[PDB]
Amino acid sequence: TLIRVTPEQPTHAVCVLGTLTQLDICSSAPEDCTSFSINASPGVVVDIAHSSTWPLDPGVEVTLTMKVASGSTGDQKVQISYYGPKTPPVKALLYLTGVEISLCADITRTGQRTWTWGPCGQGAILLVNCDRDLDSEDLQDMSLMTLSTKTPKDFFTNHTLVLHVARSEMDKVRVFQAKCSVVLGPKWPSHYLMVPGGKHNMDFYVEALAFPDTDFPGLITLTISLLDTSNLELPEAVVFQDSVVFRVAPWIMTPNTQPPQEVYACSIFENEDFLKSVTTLAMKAKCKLTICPEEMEIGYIQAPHKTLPVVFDSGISGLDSFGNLEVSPPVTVRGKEYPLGRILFGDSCYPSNDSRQMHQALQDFLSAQQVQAPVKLYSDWLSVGHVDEFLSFVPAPDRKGFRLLLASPRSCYKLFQEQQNEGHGEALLFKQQKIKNILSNKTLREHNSFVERCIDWNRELLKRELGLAESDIIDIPQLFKLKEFSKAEAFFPNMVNMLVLGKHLGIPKPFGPVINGRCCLEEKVCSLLEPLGLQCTFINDGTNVRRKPFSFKWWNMVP
Amino acid sequence: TLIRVTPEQPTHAVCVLGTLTQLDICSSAPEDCTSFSINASPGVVVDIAHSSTWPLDPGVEVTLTMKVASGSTGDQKVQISYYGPKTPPVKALLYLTGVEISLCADITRTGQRTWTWGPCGQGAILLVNCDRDLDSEDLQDMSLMTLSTKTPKDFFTNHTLVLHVARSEMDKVRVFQAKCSVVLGPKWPSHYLMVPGGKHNMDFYVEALAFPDTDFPGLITLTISLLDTSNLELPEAVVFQDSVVFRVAPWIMTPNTQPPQEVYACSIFENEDFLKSVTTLAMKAKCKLTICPEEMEIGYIQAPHKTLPVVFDSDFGYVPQTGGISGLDSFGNLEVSPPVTVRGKEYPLGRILFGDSCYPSNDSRQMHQALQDFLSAQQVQAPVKLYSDWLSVGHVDEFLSFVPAPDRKGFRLLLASPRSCYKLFQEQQNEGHGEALLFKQQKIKNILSNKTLREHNSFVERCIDWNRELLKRELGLAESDIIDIPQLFKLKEFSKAEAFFPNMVNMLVLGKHLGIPKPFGPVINGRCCLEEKVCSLLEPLGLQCTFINDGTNVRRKPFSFKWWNMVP
């Protein structure tokens, strides 16, 4: 700020430690003036920012700061002298006064005011309080704001400290003083602080109320202001202001390759056959299987002090379900490394009167969480319309680190022809049809060509939207047959959707052809999956799999 | 698209140029094959990624493309000679075919296929059809995209081409297929283009319907899809897809420092003397004064086709809340700074400044948020909030304004500073002639013997100092570029500030010629003292001032700096 002084009478000024208070000596100068000498207190930082006896430049900023907060009203005073050849120097007095006002927060991102990203960047992280709540848990889920002012005892008789936020971001932040006392929030964008003289520390804890959205660009700001108030008839004037940086935590979705922590079940009560295999699997996996004690997708928000998990659930189309919403492993797309995955979702290739796609609200919601940029897919030609019915990710403890199982009906034809060319071509599937009875259906060949053509489009679109390669995709046999409105469906029960319970998993049984008392599809999928290092269990086939939240924190990427 | 070859029979396909033709080699491989070979001419651009014994690698990439276009089916032949150790070499066949597909437009931000800002960006700007506006006339002002298809004639009997926009973007693009023409717009998301085979060129004219706003970042995309319908019962299969991207041109405001092209007037009063002075002043400025025969800001949406002037209001181009609004969000509040440099970020197109309070409060006033989010969507001009609620008018131009100056950085900011008025009054009374009458008439010694005025007046100087530091940090200004205009302020009910005598800074500027309202000040030596100072400080630089007893909107030239060359 600027203060201007009149030589005929003393006046009162205030400088805050840390800011360079500008002083102009020329505009309000005495009538005749050409040379200046500074004889000031040793404790005052009086610098010059733009002894060579430089003349009175129009704009010559003299920066002023003082360190030691006083005890009385304006102990320190400053005087200037101006020596010329016309008369002895004239005098000006300034009643200066030091104070210290500091607002420190989670500056190190370890646990400061306007939202900001950055792996090496300044800004605290806010956990979204989508629930309405003490003690340690409050100390550990809200960010830390600490207020420290060193002042003269009677200094705040004529001064005031005010704490405020911008009016566009007022709705989605809230701060408590330390039941909890509301300082700011959706209703109060500003407040005045009651700080007595000397030292008084009042601490604040910060929370949000919403996730990044379309109408929420990505700032929440804080600014501290100092008011000069010496006269009771004039409006309040400002002397000091600081404005700095903190950011909100988004929502996240969890893939099927993380080491699980807790898995669940449903209520169909076929568990005695269903949950027997999965229960023995969890005993093999040493995972804690609390079945459902008695559609729902599991994510987590994180801060430097907490990683509280959350769950979400849901003019309705068949492509809007979360089964059409599948998250890739930690990925790297064209240099942009998404350690939190790229959400993958299916819609049509061109819209028409009959095309289907997601609600734009949901796509924008996943877009606004710029940690996971979504990807458009093509799963409209399929009758149900989900991506999980033809794509899946399974853990890979070697090579690249994750395996994409993709349905491919053309390897099924290869195997069926191969085992028919071995003499025993009368294997019974499931009515029951021979291998010849299926290889002698020309309609199936054309249906298969059409379905594989639709598959390849999605395939290419994953290889470009996930940074994939030919070595990272493995094909599983699955024949397809069309239906009403010429929509595709699987021939035998789907084998690409399955329960990943670790490095060993559960796949539904094919109930297919029997080869010397064994199912050929089963031995093939085991010869294609197990050598990588997995173990597969086969069962007649509702399950939600909570996993360990990522070691990577969302604030360490550059979106 | 992926192409798969089965050893039982060869497969025919159409390979559109622009996609590296990928070949699948593992899913449908022969039962005894472990290696295979290729046969083609040296001129063929064959792309292989690991004769020569190429085995069945899990990640061997095979992409093929051609150096010509085919209007005749299978003008080139490519046999893939799989070779087996104990099996005679089986040969997968593929009669190559390429159609010439061209989606040509103004795609260097000059209206991956993406949009990037900067002087060397990619994209196409479209201008808003804010008018209520045959085929020969609109070809110059509109954006025309050229779709060139060179395909065999028999294609479009079992193939269809489809143009479309997303199911969120229809109401923001209208395309005309070169009166009434609905291709894809407010009601139609897609169009089945009836394209005769052979070689054919197609033109579309594109106009918007909305400016960048809160919900619209500004980018739109248009995609053409090439399908396949060989069978009449099964669904269509996509063969190729191409895309282009546009951005809506955003409205740009106009500062008070740009050369004039058309000055406008309003016959609110008779003001014959004012009118004669204005026409004399405009003839001195050599501008075409268009009197209206019986606020509104005249900007421009600059595009690489035309720079249509834009009328923004609360002819040219004309671009709401039910009620209960406050008067201080009017358009006199929004003033455009010249190009500046703020904390490193440099703004060639200006920094919009407006009226608000320094800290939000219950009695504080601020602009309607709609304009703030609007001009924020205009990422070209990042706004700045200032401390100008301490007046009862709340307009930033009531105490500061930018005048042209051929010296240094080309602009000078007049700030209404109380304290120079008192300084000059002190000097004039010190020299002796301190009893001249002002204007209700009051004396020079009387005001200098008024201390209440010195306190209201010093408080206003404190507010001016705060806003001065704000401009030094939010406009990157300096202390030497601020002329302290002598001007006194007073307070009224609710402690709001007002001008005492007519404000010399709320002046209608029409170039270098300052139409300053008359101060009606003390008379000494023949002239007015405030007039004396303003003539003794501006004239040594070269300005010319005329003092009228004061509704003049001035359309001005564009900055000639293309908006698509800067990074928000």
PDB file of C-alpha atoms in Angstrom, chain B residues 316-396:
ATOM      1  CA  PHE B 316     -23.981  -4.160 -36.729  1.00  0.00           C
ATOM      2  CA  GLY B 317     -24.663  -7.303 -34.646  1.00  0.00           C
ATOM      3  CA  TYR B 318     -26.959  -7.451 -31.660  1.00  0.00           C
ATOM      4  CA  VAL B 319     -25.864  -9.758 -28.848  1.00  0.00           C
ATOM      5  CA  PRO B 320     -32.295 -12.182 -19.388  1.00  0.00           C
ATOM      6  CA  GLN B 321     -33.081 -11.860 -15.678  1.00  0.00           C
ATOM      7  CA  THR B 322     -36.742 -11.260 -14.856  1.00  0.00           C
ATOM      8  CA  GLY B 323     -36.147  -8.256 -12.620  1.00  0.00           C
ATOM      9  CA  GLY B 324     -35.025  -6.946  -9.268  1.00  0.00           C
ATOM     10  CA  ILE B 325     -31.620  -5.935 -10.653  1.00  0.00           C
ATOM     11  CA  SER B 326     -29.376  -3.200  -9.240  1.00  0.00           C
ATOM     12  CA  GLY B 327     -28.314  -0.208 -11.299  1.00  0.00           C
ATOM     13  CA  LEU B 328     -24.581  -0.526 -10.643  1.00  0.00           C
ATOM     14  CA  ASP B 329     -24.086  -3.506 -12.982  1.00  0.00           C
ATOM     15  CA  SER B 330     -24.608  -1.246 -16.012  1.00  0.00           C
ATOM     16  CA  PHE B 331     -22.161  -1.122 -18.899  1.00  0.00           C
ATOM     17  CA  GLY B 332     -20.420   2.075 -17.826  1.00  0.00           C
ATOM     18  CA  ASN B 333     -18.900  -0.006 -15.013  1.00  0.00           C
ATOM     19  CA  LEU B 334     -17.050  -2.347 -17.409  1.00  0.00           C
ATOM     20  CA  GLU B 335     -13.942  -0.571 -18.711  1.00  0.00           C
ATOM     21  CA  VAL B 336     -11.261  -2.210 -20.836  1.00  0.00           C
ATOM     22  CA  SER B 337      -7.618  -1.692 -19.968  1.00  0.00           C
ATOM     23  CA  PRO B 338      -5.071  -1.530 -22.797  1.00  0.00           C
ATOM     24  CA  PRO B 339      -2.791  -4.542 -23.333  1.00  0.00           C
ATOM     25  CA  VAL B 340      -0.891  -5.136 -20.099  1.00  0.00           C
ATOM     26  CA  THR B 341       1.550  -7.421 -18.282  1.00  0.00           C
ATOM     27  CA  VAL B 342       0.301  -8.684 -14.907  1.00  0.00           C
ATOM     28  CA  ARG B 343       2.591 -10.851 -12.760  1.00  0.00           C
ATOM     29  CA  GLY B 344       4.143 -12.356 -15.893  1.00  0.00           C
ATOM     30  CA  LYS B 345       0.883 -13.148 -17.683  1.00  0.00           C
ATOM     31  CA  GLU B 346       0.742 -10.745 -20.624  1.00  0.00           C
ATOM     32  CA  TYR B 347      -2.612  -9.722 -22.129  1.00  0.00           C
ATOM     33  CA  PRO B 348      -2.422  -8.266 -25.681  1.00  0.00           C
ATOM     34  CA  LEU B 349      -6.218  -7.907 -25.980  1.00  0.00           C
ATOM     35  CA  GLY B 350      -6.762  -6.018 -22.719  1.00  0.00           C
ATOM     36  CA  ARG B 351      -7.789  -6.668 -19.132  1.00  0.00           C
ATOM     37  CA  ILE B 352     -11.420  -5.922 -18.327  1.00  0.00           C
ATOM     38  CA  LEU B 353     -11.874  -3.957 -15.095  1.00  0.00           C
ATOM     39  CA  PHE B 354     -15.137  -3.602 -13.172  1.00  0.00           C
ATOM     40  CA  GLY B 355     -16.794  -2.317 -10.021  1.00  0.00           C
ATOM     41  CA  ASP B 356     -17.146  -4.387  -6.863  1.00  0.00           C
ATOM     42  CA  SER B 357     -16.127  -4.263  -3.223  1.00  0.00           C
ATOM     43  CA  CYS B 358     -12.655  -5.092  -1.953  1.00  0.00           C
ATOM     44  CA  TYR B 359     -14.065  -7.714   0.422  1.00  0.00           C
ATOM     45  CA  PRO B 360     -17.492  -9.349   0.046  1.00  0.00           C
ATOM     46  CA  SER B 361     -20.093  -8.348   2.622  1.00  0.00           C
ATOM     47  CA  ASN B 362     -23.858  -8.107   3.098  1.00  0.00           C
ATOM     48  CA  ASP B 363     -24.090  -4.457   1.971  1.00  0.00           C
ATOM     49  CA  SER B 364     -21.407  -4.811  -0.717  1.00  0.00           C
ATOM     50  CA  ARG B 365     -22.205  -4.404  -4.401  1.00  0.00           C
ATOM     51  CA  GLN B 366     -20.771  -6.308  -7.353  1.00  0.00           C
ATOM     52  CA  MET B 367     -21.544  -6.869 -11.025  1.00  0.00           C
ATOM     53  CA  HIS B 368     -24.115  -9.412 -12.070  1.00  0.00           C
ATOM     54  CA  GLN B 369     -22.251 -12.719 -12.048  1.00  0.00           C
ATOM     55  CA  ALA B 370     -23.499 -13.599 -15.537  1.00  0.00           C
ATOM     56  CA  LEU B 371     -21.236 -11.042 -17.230  1.00  0.00           C
ATOM     57  CA  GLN B 372     -18.294 -12.136 -15.076  1.00  0.00           C
ATOM     58  CA  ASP B 373     -18.633 -15.790 -16.086  1.00  0.00           C
ATOM     59  CA  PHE B 374     -19.260 -14.628 -19.659  1.00  0.00           C
ATOM     60  CA  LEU B 375     -16.059 -12.594 -19.933  1.00  0.00           C
ATOM     61  CA  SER B 376     -14.287 -15.446 -18.149  1.00  0.00           C
ATOM     62  CA  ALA B 377     -15.470 -17.772 -20.919  1.00  0.00           C
ATOM     63  CA  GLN B 378     -13.861 -15.164 -23.148  1.00  0.00           C
ATOM     64  CA  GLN B 379     -10.506 -16.460 -21.906  1.00  0.00           C
ATOM     65  CA  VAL B 380      -8.916 -13.810 -24.141  1.00  0.00           C
ATOM     66  CA  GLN B 381      -9.759 -11.044 -21.633  1.00  0.00           C
ATOM     67  CA  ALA B 382      -9.279 -12.163 -18.032  1.00  0.00           C
ATOM     68  CA  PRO B 383     -11.241  -9.758 -15.795  1.00  0.00           C
ATOM     69  CA  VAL B 384      -9.978  -7.890 -12.747  1.00  0.00           C
ATOM     70  CA  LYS B 385     -12.147  -6.900  -9.791  1.00  0.00           C
ATOM     71  CA  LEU B 386     -11.441  -3.510  -8.253  1.00  0.00           C
ATOM     72  CA  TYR B 387     -12.302  -1.377  -5.218  1.00  0.00           C
ATOM     73  CA  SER B 388     -14.805   1.071  -6.679  1.00  0.00           C
ATOM     74  CA  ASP B 389     -17.860   0.514  -4.460  1.00  0.00           C
ATOM     75  CA  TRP B 390     -16.782   3.544  -2.400  1.00  0.00           C
ATOM     76  CA  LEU B 391     -18.636   5.772  -4.870  1.00  0.00           C
ATOM     77  CA  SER B 392     -22.406   6.016  -5.221  1.00  0.00           C
ATOM     78  CA  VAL B 393     -22.050   5.306  -8.956  1.00  0.00           C
ATOM     79  CA  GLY B 394     -19.607   2.406  -8.754  1.00  0.00           C
ATOM     80  CA  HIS B 395     -18.051   2.881 -12.190  1.00  0.00           C
ATOM     81  CA  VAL B 396     -14.289   2.529 -12.567  1.00  0.00           C
TER      82      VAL B 396
END
